[PDB]
C-alpha cells in the first residue's frame, strides 16, 4: 500500500489522503494515531463506513486501486498520522506506511503480558474484552515497532475456526480465543529482536477480519526482545 508521507492543510480546509494498492479488488480502512505511543482510532472502515462516535467531517471513498480519506473542515485535533489498511490475495491485513497530517496556522480491549524477553523465548499476550458480545466478532493483533508503522500479527474468527498471520510471524505465531472468558491470546515463539514493539488487540466490525475492517483498538502492551 502506498500513501503519501505527509499532507498539510489549514483549519476548515478539505484535505484528502490517498492509499493505492496492487489491484481494485479490496477495500480500505483508516486508522488515526495522534502520537507513536498511543492506541489508534478507526475513523473510516470498509471504504466509507464511519463509526457513530467519529465526527461527520470524516468520509471515505474508493476508486479503482485507490482509497481516499477526506476530512471536510479539518480541525487542529485531527493532526495525526493516518494509516490505511487493506488486504491482498496473500495476506488478510496490510498497511501503508502512514500519512502525517500537519494542520497549519494553529467497547474495551485490555492487553497484558508485555515485558522483556530473550531471543528464542516465547511471548504470551492476553486481551480481556468487555462492553460487547465478544463471541460475535473476529479479533486480532496488530503491532508497531519503535518508529515504524502498523503490521499484521494475527487474526481469528468469532468462533475460532479460522486464523491467519502476518508474513513476519507466520509459522511462529498462534492466536486463540476463549469465548467463555471473553479473551483472545497471542503466542509468539522463537522471539527475535525485530519482534519488539507495541502489540495492540483489535476488533473486527463484524464483516470479517481484514486490514480494512478494524473498528476498535486496545491500549497496547510493550514487548522488548533483547
Numbering used by the authors: 2 to 107, 125 to 244
Which of the paper's sentences describe this entry?
We characterized these conformation-sensor antibodies, such as scFv45, which stabilized the reversibly oxidized, inactive form of PTP1B.
From the model it was clear that acidic residues dominated the complementarity-determining region (CDR) of scFv45; Asp89 and Asp93 of scFv45 formed hydrogen-bonding interactions with basic residues Arg47 and Lys41 of PTP1B-OX, respectively. By mapping the regional boundaries of the binding interface that were determined by our structural proteomic approach onto this model, we noted strong corroboration between the individual datasets. The acidic residues of scFv45 in the CDR region, which are critical for interaction with PTP1B-OX, were found to be lacking in scFv20, suggesting a molecular explanation for the lack of interaction observed between PTP1B-OX and scFv20. Our analysis demonstrates that a cluster of basic residues unique to PTP1B over TCPTP were required for interaction with acidic residues in the complementarity-determining regions of those scFv constructs that bound to the oxidized form of the phosphatase.
